[PDB]
Chains A and B, each alone.
Chain A
Amino acid sequence: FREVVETQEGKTTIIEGRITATPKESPNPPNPSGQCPICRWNLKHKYNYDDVLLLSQFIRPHGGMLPRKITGLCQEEHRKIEECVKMAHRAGLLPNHRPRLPKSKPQLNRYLTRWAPGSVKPIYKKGPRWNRVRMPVGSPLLRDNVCYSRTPWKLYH
């Protein structure tokens, strides 16, 4: 990881870049030949939004996701990680990855929030039983996650 440092001296500002210490993948992945980190470490369908220890490894210091060309994630797992990161941010599980810079907003505890809180209109007219307007929960991208319960996940409530 390189960091750009700028110093203003007199009227001659300098700016350079220094390569700090970089993390290294843990030795001996359980499943070598995996084309991406997840499928290589046997995590294809065994992580959720709350697995911050996993998600943060693909996180910019301010909460943004990292590109595929850098992370090495396959497309599907990259989408899954992005959605899990969004859900974790909305649930407040990443308090040290906040946006760079605040009036006090009401504190409502959330989790498994698919949509941005400010982009969903209230369901004033829920439909009849056969056409009910249901509130999405979680993400369909995780529909294939390992299900230890007999009943599958209910992605809509």
Chain B
Amino acid sequence: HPWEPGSFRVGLIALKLGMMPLWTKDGQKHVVTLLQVQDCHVLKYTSKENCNGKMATLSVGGKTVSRFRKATSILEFYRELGLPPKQTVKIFNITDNAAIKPGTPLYAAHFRPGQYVDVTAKTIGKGFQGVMKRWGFKGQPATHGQTKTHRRPGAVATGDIGRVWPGTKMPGKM
């Protein structure tokens, strides 16, 4: 179908290769990241009614992986689709105008220069981190008597409530 206002097309699943500089004609540097589209294919399509959401959904799979390390159901699904199993499958909300047959490949040219895009990914896992690094708490002074308190959280709550509010910023996985 031709493009119409209010239409949302499918995206891709790329692989973060790295970063490099890129200079514009005004002599300004910009750090630009490299996203490589590695074996990106449409895998599944569910219509508005089928998914019950406000928009249809297209599943897109990327970074083909070994068939020996995938669940039997996933292997069956990919065998029926006719493609090797992909590392990640993500769901894109689209209008019915942008429906694409499952199995079709997607390419980096799907986007074009000058466009503006949104990129979602799992952030670098820093594990169980202290309050200072996780929430940028000031911490306590290094000297002037401080006994065994340099990076600990201060008061976590007030005395009256006699509890800790849900959502309190505490040390934990970051």
Consider the complex of A and B and state whether they touch directly, i.e. have CB atoms less than 8 Å apart: no
